[PDB]
Amino acid sequence: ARVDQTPQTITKETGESLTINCVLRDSHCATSSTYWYRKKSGSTNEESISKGGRYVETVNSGSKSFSLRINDLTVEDSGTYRCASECQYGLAEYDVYGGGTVVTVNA
Amino acid sequence: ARVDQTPQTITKETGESLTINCVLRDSHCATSSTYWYRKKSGSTNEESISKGGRYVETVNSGSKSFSLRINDLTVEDSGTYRCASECQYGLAEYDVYGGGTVVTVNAA
Amino acid sequence: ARVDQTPQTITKETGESLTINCVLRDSHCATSSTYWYRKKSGSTNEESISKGGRYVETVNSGSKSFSLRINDLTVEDSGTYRCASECQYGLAEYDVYGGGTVVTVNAAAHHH
Amino acid sequence: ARVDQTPQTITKETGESLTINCVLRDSHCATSSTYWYRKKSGSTNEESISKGGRYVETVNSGSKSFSLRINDLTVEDSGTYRCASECQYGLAEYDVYGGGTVVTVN
Amino acid sequence: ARVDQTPQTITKETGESLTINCVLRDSHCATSSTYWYRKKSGSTNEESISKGGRYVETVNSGSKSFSLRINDLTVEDSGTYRCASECQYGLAEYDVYGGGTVVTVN
Amino acid sequence: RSSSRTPSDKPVAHVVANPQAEGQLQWLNRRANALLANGVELRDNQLVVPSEGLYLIYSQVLFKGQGCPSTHVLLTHTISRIAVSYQTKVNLLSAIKSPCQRETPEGAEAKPWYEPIYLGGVFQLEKGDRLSAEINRPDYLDFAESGQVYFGIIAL
Amino acid sequence: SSRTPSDKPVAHVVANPQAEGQLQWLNRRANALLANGVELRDNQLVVPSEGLYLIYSQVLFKGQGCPSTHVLLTHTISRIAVSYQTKVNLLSAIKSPCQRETPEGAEAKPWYEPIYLGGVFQLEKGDRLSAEINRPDYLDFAESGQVYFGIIAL
Amino acid sequence: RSSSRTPSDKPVAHVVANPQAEGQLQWLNRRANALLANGVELRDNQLVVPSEGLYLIYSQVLFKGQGCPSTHVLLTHTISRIAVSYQTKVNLLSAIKSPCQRETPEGAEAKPWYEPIYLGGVFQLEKGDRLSAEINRPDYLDFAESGQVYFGIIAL
Amino acid sequence: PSDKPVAHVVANPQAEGQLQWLNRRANALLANGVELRDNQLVVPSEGLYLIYSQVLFKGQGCPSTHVLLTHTISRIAVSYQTKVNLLSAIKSPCQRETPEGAEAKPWYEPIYLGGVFQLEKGDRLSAEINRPDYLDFAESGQVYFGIIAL
Amino acid sequence: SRTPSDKPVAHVVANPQAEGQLQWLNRRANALLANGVELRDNQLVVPSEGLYLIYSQVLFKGQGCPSTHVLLTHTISRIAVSYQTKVNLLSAIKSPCQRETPEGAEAKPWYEPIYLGGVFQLEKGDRLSAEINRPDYLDFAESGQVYFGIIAL
Amino acid sequence: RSSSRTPSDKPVAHVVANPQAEGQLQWLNRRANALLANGVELRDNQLVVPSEGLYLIYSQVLFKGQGCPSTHVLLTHTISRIAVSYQTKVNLLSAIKSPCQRETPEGAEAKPWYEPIYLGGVFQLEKGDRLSAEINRPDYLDFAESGQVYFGIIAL
């Protein structure tokens, strides 16, 4: 574990909306310091997805889960999206990641 | 701890029989009003075990100790089992509990 | 011979720490259900020592041995300490005990 | 070695008495918690010899030594005898053993 | 307080005499069970003064007072002397104290 | 750190007397070689049969005294049964023993006597029958060393 | 009898020499310690208080001749935590004792290879440390302190 | 939905190798079961001692290669110290290991060799001393799994 | 001002075929009561210590049969005055294949031991190896030995 | 039950499995509710006219102070048959945090107890009720830290 | 290597002082012509009788001094018994001896004196009785030479 991406492989068509869920399994990681990273298919320039507009982020502190809704899917929104969180207990502070691929086919 | 449930962790196989024993340490609780509760892992309901058939109970009023042997074990009988007793001395009335978990593994 | 309490006679000084070791010789008794009782010299009541804080318990199920290290000794901690364990095999269920005495001598507080 | 069993091989006749002596070399083991074990030749059971009657135990705390005299010897007392002691200093707790074989001919 | 020790600070020379008087202020304390305690200068241990020999005890129950006269004062008998009395009324029974110091030169 | 390694069934009971009971016969099962399982209840020093069937009933008692000046000493040991069908305590097994035939042990020093008594039999018991093993002189009980006094049943 | 008190959770367990083909941890031997709250459950060490610990273990592997080319000996100290209930490796080592060889015409070649692991970690209450090996059939717990495992609260 | 009230300590560090660092040994601290706290700082793949005192230094590296095509390969692993009093690289702990003693996989291959190296010792360090754990061949690192390569100090 | 008995001794490089421990060397310690007597460390106070030592073995070829490289830390105590091993390890450097009339192949095999033990006043620790002819004390900190009272 | 005893008495303790609420319980060791005292909806109903002794304790625990404006209150109130309005018999106020809004990430749990006690004349059917305004700071974890009781003197 | 070649019984003990004890009387059994066998245990310099019966108890002590520091020195030697029946130390055999006849070597120099004391008698002892051979002045003991000070019992 250490954060669990639920929709592993999704294949949607241009003009739709995919939701990606990540669930915290470490009771030291917080749903408050969540981050998102995208890697366009066939390129190793993993960028940081920004929270705003087409990319909406929902947090629920009760179930220790955060999700990332992506709207208006294009043919360039095909890649590998990973989630992240900041954990801190005593003298240790670290971060955790996931993994899950997105492919969008165009109409 | 008033009442001591002894087999804390059990792991038996399908088709077996587990014995869970409780000993009273409070000399005010009675072996006549004894109670048994099972709580299946993942459920939020504590169920009341009925005394008969698969559920056999052994009591000794001298030692203030009772047991609960459970036969024909399935794999859906995996959960936390607790024992209980009702105590009363003067103007006092209360009940007592324990703690102990069961896990049963399937077969083929 | 069914639980062996080793330090039978102990004499420590006020403010110190004694460890009592008990070894299970009956291979049906469990190191998970261990109990401790002390009886202060001159009084008739076995009280049950609780596991926490000043009363530290070390257990090894591999050799089926458990111990009880007691810190901050006073002069009111002088008494007979016994260990206990809960045994269970087939249709049989029983318990076992030991024996061992502690006497704590005072510090006398040097006056100038 | 920690605990020194001296008569390592004894061979007696039925109806006599073998004495096995053990001396402590570790000063943390106590002459108070002594144990004896025999394992009869051919069996996989180490039995614990109990002190009373036919099994006599002599202890001297000064020399940290104990002995085990066995009387009325039969032919069922053929095996390996070991002695034991409980040692304790600080945070350390252990036990110690020896070794020595007995054969009785009729 | 209860039990007023009157000579608070006294200064005598080796070869003189001191009487210390205590007057009861609690009407539950009795002049019958009176005790005296001194602490020799230098150590913080209370010794029990004996009511015989040098230390003579005079009691006057009418005035509810008791005293402790010392005949031959030496030089090491310099210290804080306190008086005591045992009181008992209803379900309560207790004791009471005072204070008074002696200094002896040569 | 252990559990059962074979099921085993039928009502069973083998209880041994309490050694730290100065002058009474209190039945115990929470000891090394004692049994009380598969439904058998020990109520007020009485065994309660949980099911109708054929049982084997037995008990042994050992009497010890350090001299007997009273010729008139009679030792009895009886297993009694009160059934749900006939609510009167009736004897199933009984025995009597005379320990003392002397000339009042006089002048010299004491002399301990030991007399044991054993009872056993097979009976048909019904649900709820209360069996009780009792003795008339519980001041001569010798439960000192070993399992010298006991009482038990087994559903065959 | 005892002497100076001493404290801190401490553990130094030694393999059972009389265990044939398995790794049983013991404390009731001369130079072994297990005190001040450390519990050894199912061949597992249970931390009694939260803090920084020093973890170490050595395993000695011995075989009488090399049968397989693809023989890999492993030794890991694992931790299953209360916050994250999955067993994760803290310290690990892998060792291949046999570079091909596989003695055909020979007279057995006994090999000895030890493995040592150590590190400092922050542990929580109830965490279970476990020292494990993949092939406990090559353990050489013969002479002395050749196999051991311990923690100490620093 | 939980609570935490845990204390702290003294200068400590336990860093783990970077798994996604291609053919290189990059030390990391922001990963599970890794520590870098109470003043120990990691600059240029080096640990900077925050206070003078007695320290315990340790490090392990795992070497893996997918064949032995050279009977003349040397694997070394050293923890060195450049100090404020003497600004020269000096070795505190060092070890050498020859991974391939055989006559190369001349026929079939797929013989992965694994050779670990461990270092440990206690030293007196001053404020500002920079400790560094290094290997001679960073192309044989096996950082594929977790806790295979690490390096740390702890203030005793 | 650092207390607690400590020791970290390193081998003498200019020592002919022997493992002689030195303390008056750059990065070595022997203080707060631990004394180095007859090539042995003497524990000055009862308590919990961390004992460690590493040895580096080097040879210029695999001679006849197998060589066993052993490295052991021993303790002779006042309570039980016989040398007993606290930590031990054995390693066989030569995987057979003794040089078959060809040229050498220098092998390196190090061995490390470490653990926590309870020591009493007057206990004598010694780190020792069986073949002091394979010691590689050419560099610094390749063979060393130390304790610290934790 | 081998002891007589009388006089209406009650000593109830909070239910630990209540999360954010103060439910008074009597069916626990060292708790009393006997000789006529009725407990309705978290309220004690006096069974007889006479002199009673009323007491209660609450323990408040917090993990951080988000606002200077923290007010902790504890009151034992009485609604009587003669005057059908709730009146306070015993009351106490405590401000646990004098500003000092904890800065950073320091988790320093604060604990504050409050105790009330007094003698009163109560009539038959009078309802006494012990309540607190912030049942979100109750620490009923350990044991006899929160309770409420009366005894007929 | 040899074997035993005699069978014998009856609890026996003949313990002799330790010469390497300096100023104390520690009893030894692991010396040439000394015995401690057949059940007798020696705890705190005390013999514990293992079985009830009639015993012969004896002990001798040798006192030596190289001068009298006073004309009022008293040498005593006693064998005591604390019994399970009556747990008070009572003297079974006792003797007193005055070593210095009006001297306290004043007009001349020091002078080595030797004075022995012997005790023996028959008594009935019970199981668990603790007998102790004791002296008041353990600094005048001369356990240098051979069997000069000893203590023993034998079951008749």
Ligand SMILES: [Cl-]
């Ligand atoms: Cl904690």
